[PDB]
Amino acid sequence: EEELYYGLNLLIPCVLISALALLVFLLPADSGEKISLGITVLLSLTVFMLLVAEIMPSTSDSSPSIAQYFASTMIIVGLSVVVTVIVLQYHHHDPDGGEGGGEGIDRLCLMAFSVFTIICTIGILMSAPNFVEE
């Protein structure tokens, strides 16, 4: 049961950050939150990763399950923040007023990461739903 409970508590923050990010992606205010959340999610990943990596070590039994998934994630997550920045440079038009003012690319990058998380959690869940040894 700990497998489900643990992952759950880990999904809270995972999806949380992604959500808060969308709020900025679609609403590029460029007031400071861009760089603020940038390092936030970056530092939040490295930390959370250490925990997931601690439970799944590799010294006597080399067989990473969730780790292999958590790693590939940081990869797409890293280059992602890079593109967002460059985009902000090119487009120097971020007026203030109300709401509504995003871009297609930003939306696509979000929709992709969205399903990526859903298929991820289920990936390891279906790969080994049992609580047996390995």
Element (H, E) at 129: none
**Distance between CA atoms of residues 130 and 126, nearest Å:** 9
**Distance between CA atoms of residues 79 and 70, nearest Å:** 15
Domain count for the chain, please give it.
1
- Both tokens of 100, joined, read 């509504």
Amino acid of residue 88: L
| Signed CA dihedral, 18, 24, 27, 28: sign only | negative
DSSP state of 132: -
**Distance between CA atoms of residues 116 and 69, nearest Å:** 11
Which distant-in-sequence residues (6+ apart) come within 8 Å of 80 by Cβ?
A: 109, 113
Number of helical (H) and strand (E) elements in the chain, helices listed first = 4, 0
**Distance between CA atoms of residues 19 and 14, nearest Å:** 9
Domain region containing 110:
1-134
Which CATH number is 34's domain given? Answer: 1.20.58.390
Largest CA distance in the chain: 59
